[PDB]
Coordinates of C-alpha atoms and ligand atoms in Angstrom, one line a residue:
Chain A
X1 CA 12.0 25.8 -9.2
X2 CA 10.2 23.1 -7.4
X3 CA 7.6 21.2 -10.1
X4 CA 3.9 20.9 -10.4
X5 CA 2.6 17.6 -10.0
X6 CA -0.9 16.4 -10.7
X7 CA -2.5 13.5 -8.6
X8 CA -5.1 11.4 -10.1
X9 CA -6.7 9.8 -7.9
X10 CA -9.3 8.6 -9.8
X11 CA -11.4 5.4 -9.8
X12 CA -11.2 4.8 -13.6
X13 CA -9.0 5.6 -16.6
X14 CA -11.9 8.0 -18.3
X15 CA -12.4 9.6 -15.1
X16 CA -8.5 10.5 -15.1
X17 CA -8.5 11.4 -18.5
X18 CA -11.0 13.9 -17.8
X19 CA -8.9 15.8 -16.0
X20 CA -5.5 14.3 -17.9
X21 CA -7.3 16.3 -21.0
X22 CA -7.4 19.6 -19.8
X23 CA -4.0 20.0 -17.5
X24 CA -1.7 17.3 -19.2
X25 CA 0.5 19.9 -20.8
X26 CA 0.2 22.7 -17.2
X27 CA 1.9 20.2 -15.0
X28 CA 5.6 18.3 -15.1
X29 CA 4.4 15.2 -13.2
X30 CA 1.3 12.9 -13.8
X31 CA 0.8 10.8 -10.7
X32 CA -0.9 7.3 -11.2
X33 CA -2.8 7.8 -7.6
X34 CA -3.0 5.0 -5.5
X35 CA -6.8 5.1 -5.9
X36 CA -6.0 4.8 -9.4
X37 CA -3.6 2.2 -9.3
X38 CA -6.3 0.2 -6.8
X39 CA -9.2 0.8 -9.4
X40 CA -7.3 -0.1 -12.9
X41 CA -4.4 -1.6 -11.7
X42 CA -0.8 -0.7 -13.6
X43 CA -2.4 -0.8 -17.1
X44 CA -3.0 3.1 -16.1
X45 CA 0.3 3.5 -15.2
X46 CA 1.5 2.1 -19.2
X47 CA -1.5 3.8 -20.4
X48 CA -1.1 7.6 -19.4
X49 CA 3.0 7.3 -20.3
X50 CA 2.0 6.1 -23.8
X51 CA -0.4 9.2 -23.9
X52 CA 2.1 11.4 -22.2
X53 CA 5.5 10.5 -22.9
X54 CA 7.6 13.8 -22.5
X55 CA 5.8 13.8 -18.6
X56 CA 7.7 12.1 -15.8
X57 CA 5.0 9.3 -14.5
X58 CA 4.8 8.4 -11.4
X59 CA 3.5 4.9 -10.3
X60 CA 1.6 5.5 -6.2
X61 CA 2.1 1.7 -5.6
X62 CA 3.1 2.5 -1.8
X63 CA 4.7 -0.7 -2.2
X64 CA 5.0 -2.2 1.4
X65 CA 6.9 -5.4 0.2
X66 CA 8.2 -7.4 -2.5
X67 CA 9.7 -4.5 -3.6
X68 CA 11.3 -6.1 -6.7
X69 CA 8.3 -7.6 -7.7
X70 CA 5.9 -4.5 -7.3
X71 CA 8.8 -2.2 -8.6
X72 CA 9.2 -4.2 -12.0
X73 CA 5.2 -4.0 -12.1
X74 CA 5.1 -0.7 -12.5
X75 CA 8.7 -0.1 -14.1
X76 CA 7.6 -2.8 -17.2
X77 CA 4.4 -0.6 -17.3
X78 CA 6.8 2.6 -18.0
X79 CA 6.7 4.1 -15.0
X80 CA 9.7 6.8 -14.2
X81 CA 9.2 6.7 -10.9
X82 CA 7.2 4.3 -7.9
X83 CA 6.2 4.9 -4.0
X84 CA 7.5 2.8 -1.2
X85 CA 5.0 3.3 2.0
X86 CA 7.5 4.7 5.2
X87 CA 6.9 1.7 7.1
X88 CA 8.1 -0.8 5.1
X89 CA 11.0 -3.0 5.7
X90 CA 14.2 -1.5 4.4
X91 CA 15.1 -4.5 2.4
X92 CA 11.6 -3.6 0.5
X93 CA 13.2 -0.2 -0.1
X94 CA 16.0 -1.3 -1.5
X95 CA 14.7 -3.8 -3.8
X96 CA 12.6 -1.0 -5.3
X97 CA 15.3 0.7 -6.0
X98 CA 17.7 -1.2 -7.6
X99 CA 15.1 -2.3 -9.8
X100 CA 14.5 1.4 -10.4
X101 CA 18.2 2.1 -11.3
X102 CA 17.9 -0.8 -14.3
X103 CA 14.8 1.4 -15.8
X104 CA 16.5 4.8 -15.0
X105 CA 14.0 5.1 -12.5
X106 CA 13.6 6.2 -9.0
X107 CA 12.0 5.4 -5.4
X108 CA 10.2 7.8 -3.4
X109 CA 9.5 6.9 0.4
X110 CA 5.8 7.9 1.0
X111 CA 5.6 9.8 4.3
X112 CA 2.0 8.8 4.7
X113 CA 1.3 7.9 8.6
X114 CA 3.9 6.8 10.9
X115 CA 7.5 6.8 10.7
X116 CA 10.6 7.9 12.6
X117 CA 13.9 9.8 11.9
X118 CA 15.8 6.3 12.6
X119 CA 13.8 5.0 9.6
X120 CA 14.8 8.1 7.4
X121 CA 18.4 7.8 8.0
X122 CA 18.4 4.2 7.0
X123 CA 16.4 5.4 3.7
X124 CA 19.6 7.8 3.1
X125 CA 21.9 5.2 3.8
X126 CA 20.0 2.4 1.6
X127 CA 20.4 5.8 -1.2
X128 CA 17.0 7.0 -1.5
X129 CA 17.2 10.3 -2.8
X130 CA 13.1 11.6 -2.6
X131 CA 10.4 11.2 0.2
X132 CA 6.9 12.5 -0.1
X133 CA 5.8 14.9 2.9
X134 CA 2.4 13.9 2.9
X135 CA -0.2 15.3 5.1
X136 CA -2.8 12.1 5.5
X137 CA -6.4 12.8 3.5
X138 CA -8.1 10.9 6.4
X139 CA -6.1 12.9 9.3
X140 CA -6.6 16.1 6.8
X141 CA -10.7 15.2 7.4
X142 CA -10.0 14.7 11.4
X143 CA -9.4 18.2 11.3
X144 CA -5.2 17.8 11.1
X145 CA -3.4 21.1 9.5
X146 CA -0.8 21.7 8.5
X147 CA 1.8 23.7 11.1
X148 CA 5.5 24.3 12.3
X149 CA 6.3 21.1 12.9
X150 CA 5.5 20.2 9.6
X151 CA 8.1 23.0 8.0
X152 CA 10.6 21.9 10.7
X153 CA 10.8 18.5 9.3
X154 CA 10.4 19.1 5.9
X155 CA 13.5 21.1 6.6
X156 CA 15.3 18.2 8.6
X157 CA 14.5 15.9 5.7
X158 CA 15.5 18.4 3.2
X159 CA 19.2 19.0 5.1
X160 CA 19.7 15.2 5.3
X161 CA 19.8 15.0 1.8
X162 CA 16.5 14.0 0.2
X163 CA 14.9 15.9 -2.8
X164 CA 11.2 16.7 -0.9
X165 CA 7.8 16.4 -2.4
X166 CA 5.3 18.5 -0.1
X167 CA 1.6 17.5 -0.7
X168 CA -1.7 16.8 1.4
X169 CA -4.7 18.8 0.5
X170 CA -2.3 22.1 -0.9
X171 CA -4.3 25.0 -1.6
X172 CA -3.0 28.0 -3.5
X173 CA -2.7 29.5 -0.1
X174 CA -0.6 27.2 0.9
X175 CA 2.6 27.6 -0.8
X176 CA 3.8 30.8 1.2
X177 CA 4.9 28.4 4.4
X178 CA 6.8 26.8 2.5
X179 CA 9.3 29.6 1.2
X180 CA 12.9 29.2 1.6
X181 CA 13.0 25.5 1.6
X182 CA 14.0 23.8 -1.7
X183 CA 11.4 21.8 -2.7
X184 CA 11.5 19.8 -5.5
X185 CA 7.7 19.2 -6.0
X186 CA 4.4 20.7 -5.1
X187 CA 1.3 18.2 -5.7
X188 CA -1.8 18.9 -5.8
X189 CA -4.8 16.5 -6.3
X190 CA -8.0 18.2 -5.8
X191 CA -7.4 21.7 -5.9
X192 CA -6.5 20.8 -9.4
X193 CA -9.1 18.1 -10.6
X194 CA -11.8 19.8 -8.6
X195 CA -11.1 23.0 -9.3
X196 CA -14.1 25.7 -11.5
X197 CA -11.2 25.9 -14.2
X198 CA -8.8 23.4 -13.3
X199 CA -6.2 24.7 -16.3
X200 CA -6.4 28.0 -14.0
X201 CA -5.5 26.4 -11.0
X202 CA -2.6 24.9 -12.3
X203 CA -1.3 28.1 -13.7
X204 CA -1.9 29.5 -10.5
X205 CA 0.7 26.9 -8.9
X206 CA 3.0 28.0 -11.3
X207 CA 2.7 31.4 -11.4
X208 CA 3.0 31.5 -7.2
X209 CA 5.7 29.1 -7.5
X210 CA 8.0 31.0 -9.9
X211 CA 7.3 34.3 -7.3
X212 CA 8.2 32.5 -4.2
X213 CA 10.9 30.4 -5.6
Chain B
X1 CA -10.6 -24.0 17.2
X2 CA -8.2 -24.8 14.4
X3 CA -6.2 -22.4 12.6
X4 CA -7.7 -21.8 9.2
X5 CA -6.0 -21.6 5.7
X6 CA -5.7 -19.2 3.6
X7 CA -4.2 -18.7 0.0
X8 CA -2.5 -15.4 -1.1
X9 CA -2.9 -14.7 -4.6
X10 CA 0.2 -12.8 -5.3
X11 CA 0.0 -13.4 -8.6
X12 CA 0.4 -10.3 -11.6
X13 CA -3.0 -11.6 -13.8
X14 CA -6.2 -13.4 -13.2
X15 CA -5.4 -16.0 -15.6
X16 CA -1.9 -17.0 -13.7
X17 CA -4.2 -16.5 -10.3
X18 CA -6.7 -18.8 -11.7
X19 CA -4.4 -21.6 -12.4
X20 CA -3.7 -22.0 -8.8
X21 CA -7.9 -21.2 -7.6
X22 CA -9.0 -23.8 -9.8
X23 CA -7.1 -26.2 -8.3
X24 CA -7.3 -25.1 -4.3
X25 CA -10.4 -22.8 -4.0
X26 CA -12.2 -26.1 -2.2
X27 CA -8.8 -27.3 -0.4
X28 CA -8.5 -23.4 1.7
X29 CA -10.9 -21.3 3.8
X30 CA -9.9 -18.0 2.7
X31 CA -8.8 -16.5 -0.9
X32 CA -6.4 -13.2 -0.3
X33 CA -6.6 -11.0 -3.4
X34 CA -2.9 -10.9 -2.5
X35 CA -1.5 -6.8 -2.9
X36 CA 0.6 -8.3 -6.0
X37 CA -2.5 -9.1 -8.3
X38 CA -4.8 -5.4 -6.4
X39 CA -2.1 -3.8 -8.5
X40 CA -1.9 -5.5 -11.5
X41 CA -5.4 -5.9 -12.3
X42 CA -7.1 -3.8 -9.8
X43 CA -10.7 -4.3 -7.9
X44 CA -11.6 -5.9 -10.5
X45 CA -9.8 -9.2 -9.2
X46 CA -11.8 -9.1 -5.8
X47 CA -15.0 -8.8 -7.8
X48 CA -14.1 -12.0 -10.5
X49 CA -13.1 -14.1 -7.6
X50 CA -15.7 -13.3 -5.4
X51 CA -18.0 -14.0 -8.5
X52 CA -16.1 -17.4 -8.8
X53 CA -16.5 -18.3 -5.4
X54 CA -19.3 -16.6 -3.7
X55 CA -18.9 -19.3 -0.9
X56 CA -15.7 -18.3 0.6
X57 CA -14.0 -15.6 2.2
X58 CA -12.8 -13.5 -0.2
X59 CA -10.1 -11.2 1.0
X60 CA -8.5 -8.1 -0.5
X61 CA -5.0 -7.1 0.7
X62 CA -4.9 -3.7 -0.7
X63 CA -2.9 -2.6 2.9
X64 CA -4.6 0.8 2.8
X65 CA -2.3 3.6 3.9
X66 CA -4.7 6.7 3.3
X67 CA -8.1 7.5 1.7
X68 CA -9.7 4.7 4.2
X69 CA -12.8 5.4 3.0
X70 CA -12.0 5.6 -0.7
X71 CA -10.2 2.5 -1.0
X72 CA -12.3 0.2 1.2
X73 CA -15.9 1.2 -0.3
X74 CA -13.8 0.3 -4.0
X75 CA -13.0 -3.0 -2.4
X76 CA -16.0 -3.9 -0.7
X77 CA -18.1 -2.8 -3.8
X78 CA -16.4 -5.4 -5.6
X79 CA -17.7 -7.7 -3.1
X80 CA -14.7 -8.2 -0.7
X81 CA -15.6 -10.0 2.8
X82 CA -12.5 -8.2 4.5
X83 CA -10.4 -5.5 3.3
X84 CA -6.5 -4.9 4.8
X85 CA -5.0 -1.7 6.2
X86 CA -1.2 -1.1 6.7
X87 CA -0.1 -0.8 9.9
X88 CA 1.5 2.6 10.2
X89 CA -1.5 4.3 8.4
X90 CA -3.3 7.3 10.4
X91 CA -6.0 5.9 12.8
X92 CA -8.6 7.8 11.0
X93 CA -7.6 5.5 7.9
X94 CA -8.6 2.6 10.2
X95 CA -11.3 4.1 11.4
X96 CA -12.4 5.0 8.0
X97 CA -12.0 1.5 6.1
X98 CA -13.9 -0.1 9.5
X99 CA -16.9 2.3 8.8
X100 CA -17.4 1.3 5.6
X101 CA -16.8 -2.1 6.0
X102 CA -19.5 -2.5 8.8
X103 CA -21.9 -1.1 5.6
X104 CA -20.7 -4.0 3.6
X105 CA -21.0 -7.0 6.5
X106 CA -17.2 -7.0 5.9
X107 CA -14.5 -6.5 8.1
X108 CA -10.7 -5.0 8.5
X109 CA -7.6 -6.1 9.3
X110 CA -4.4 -4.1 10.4
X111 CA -1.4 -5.7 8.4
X112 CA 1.4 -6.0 9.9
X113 CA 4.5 -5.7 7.4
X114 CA 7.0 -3.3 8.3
X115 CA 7.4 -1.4 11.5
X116 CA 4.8 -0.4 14.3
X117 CA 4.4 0.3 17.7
X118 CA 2.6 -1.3 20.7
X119 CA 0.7 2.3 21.5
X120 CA -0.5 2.2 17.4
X121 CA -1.8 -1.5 18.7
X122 CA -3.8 -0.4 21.4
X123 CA -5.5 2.1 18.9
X124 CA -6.3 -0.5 17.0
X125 CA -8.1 -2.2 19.4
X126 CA -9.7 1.1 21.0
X127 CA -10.8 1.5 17.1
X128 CA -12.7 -1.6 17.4
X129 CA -10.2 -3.6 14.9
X130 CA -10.3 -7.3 15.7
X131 CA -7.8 -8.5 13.4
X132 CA -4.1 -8.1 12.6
X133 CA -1.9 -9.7 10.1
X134 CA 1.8 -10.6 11.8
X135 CA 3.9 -10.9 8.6
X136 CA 7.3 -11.8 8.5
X137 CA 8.4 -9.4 5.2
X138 CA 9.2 -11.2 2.4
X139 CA 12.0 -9.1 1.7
X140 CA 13.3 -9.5 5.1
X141 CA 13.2 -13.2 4.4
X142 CA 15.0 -13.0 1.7
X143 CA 17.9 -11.1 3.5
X144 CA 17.9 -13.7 5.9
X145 CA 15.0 -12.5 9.2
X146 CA 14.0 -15.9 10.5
X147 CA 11.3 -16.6 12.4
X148 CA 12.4 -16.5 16.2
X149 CA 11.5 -16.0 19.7
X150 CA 10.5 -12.4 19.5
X151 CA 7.7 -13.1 16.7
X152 CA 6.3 -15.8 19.1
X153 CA 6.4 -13.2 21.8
X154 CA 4.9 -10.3 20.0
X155 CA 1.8 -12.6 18.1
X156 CA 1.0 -14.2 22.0
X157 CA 1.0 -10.4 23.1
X158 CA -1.2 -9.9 20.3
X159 CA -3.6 -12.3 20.9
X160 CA -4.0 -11.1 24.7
X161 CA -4.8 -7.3 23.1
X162 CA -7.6 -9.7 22.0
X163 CA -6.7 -9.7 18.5
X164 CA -7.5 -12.2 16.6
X165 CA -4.0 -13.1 14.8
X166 CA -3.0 -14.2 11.0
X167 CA 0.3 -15.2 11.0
X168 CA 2.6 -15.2 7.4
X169 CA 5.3 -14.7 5.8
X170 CA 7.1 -17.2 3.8
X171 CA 5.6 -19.9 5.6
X172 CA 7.0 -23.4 5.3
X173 CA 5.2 -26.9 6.3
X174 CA 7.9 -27.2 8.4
X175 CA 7.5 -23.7 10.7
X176 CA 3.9 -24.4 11.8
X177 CA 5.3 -26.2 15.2
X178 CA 6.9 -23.0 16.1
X179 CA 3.7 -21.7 16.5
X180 CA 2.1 -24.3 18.5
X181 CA -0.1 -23.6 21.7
X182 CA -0.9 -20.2 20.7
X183 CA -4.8 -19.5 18.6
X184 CA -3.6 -18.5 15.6
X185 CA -6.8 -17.5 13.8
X186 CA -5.5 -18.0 10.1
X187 CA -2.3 -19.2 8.7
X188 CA -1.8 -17.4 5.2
X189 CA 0.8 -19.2 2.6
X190 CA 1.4 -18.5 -0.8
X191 CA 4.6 -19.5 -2.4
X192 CA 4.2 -22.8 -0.4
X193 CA 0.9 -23.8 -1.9
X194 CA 1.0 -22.2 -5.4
X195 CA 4.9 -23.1 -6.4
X196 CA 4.1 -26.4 -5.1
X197 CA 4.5 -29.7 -7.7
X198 CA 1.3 -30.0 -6.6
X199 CA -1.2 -27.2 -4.7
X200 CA -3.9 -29.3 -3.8
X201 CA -1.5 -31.7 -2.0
X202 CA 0.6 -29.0 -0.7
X203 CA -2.6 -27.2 0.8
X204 CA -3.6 -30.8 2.5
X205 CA -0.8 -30.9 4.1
X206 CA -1.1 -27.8 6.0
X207 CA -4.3 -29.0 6.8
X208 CA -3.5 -32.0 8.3
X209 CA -0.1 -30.2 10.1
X210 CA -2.6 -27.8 11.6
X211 CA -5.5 -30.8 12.7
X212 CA -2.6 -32.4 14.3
X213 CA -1.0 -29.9 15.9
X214 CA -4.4 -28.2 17.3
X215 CA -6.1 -31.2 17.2
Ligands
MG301 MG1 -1.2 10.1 -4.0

């Protein structure tokens, strides 16, 4: 069944906690969001793994170089697994990862913004194993939705080999066009943080998640 | 005019950035919050610098890929002067992180690390973005990419967009001739400067390099 992961994209560590508090245990994956990671820097990415240990952490660097460097950062902080922004070189990719592999981690390219299918086979052949199909917040607010040609790529990536993370503004009613594809995670940022009962929305994830899939 | 210098602070704490800003802050013209120390201390690194040195330009490389908005009123909050944007981010990111930073007196820069397309750089420039950042990736350095004909062709195309170009990456004393004859707005170098026996020496001599060689 694909997993429920929680974005924090929070400015602050008690602002994240707010929301850490009440859907911690309703989610598999606690993302370190790059807002967060830009406002606290990777103490929150060693702080919410000491708090939530039996969750897989993920650091949203987007690292766009010095991919050793950037992936030990976050790796020495605890993190299970880090972003590598699409565009970056693929030399940045691979340093990310083979840092990953000594912490048992993993890389996840971040399909935020411009890439090509070139680029994604070179990611396969470098052996990254997870991209994030990410619907850009800012081209979300230009009025951007989601559509066929979204689900026909997720599908390309998917069939190429890569575990997919589907995300960008997801709202319950989203999940239907998705069916049939195997994705491995859902995440959802504000219809979770922002939610009336954000513990309700989360279940909700599940609950339409365990029906579809 | 003369290229200026800048400093990237690629450093993982303030402390270890602070070793090398004591001992250039008055020998460069710009101070880059390099991406490195944005993630391991957060904004708070543009806000203690700029604190430090109200002066200068302080710059925070925090290559934006989404949430333009967001991210560049955390950065100019914290005082930044200019705030960067990655290259393949969505237009609107641009657009975004250019709004705000018009609030701030600041301004943007498109970083250039990684791949992009001429038809992204002419929305750039349609966006109103005045700066990009042509960056040789440090880990394509270290597998090798040299600088070569094709970066001097792409940075002169640049500059007749009417951008006004940084050039980095790995920079070595010894590279800046490559780049003669073209107005390079700002040569950025970090290991060069802060690995250095000694920084301040190592920063005067890219200033005298780049007096001579755009003198
Ligand atoms: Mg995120």
């Amino acid at each position: 069944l694909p997993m429920l992961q929680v974005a924090l994209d929070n400015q602050t560590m008690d602002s994240a906690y707010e929301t850490t508090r009440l859907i911690a245990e309703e989610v598999d994956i606690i993302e370190v969001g790059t807002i967060l990671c830009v406002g606290e820097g990777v103490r929150a990415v060693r702080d919410l793994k000491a708090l939530y240990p039996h969750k897989i952490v993920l650091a949203d660097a987007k690292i766009a170089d010095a991919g050793k460097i950037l992936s030990r950062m976050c790796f020495e902080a605890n993190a299970d697994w880090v972003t590598v922004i699409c565009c970056a070189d693929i030399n940045t990719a691979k340093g990310a990862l083979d840092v990953a592999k000594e912490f048992n981690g993993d890389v996840q390219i971040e399909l935020t913004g411009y890439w090509t299918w070139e680029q994604a086979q070179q990611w396969r052949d470098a052996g990254i194993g997870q991209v994030v199909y990410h619907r850009s917040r800012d081209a979300q607010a230009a009025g951007v939705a989601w559509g066929e040609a979204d689900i026909t790529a997720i599908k390309r990536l998917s069939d190429m080999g890569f575990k997919v993370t589907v995300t960008g503004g997801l709202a319950l009613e989203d999940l239907p066009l998705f069916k049939g594809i195997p994705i491995h995670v859902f995440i959802a940022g504000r219809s979770i943080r922002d939610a009336a009962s954000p513990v309700e929305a989360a279940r909700q994830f599940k609950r339409s998640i365990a029906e579809l899939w």
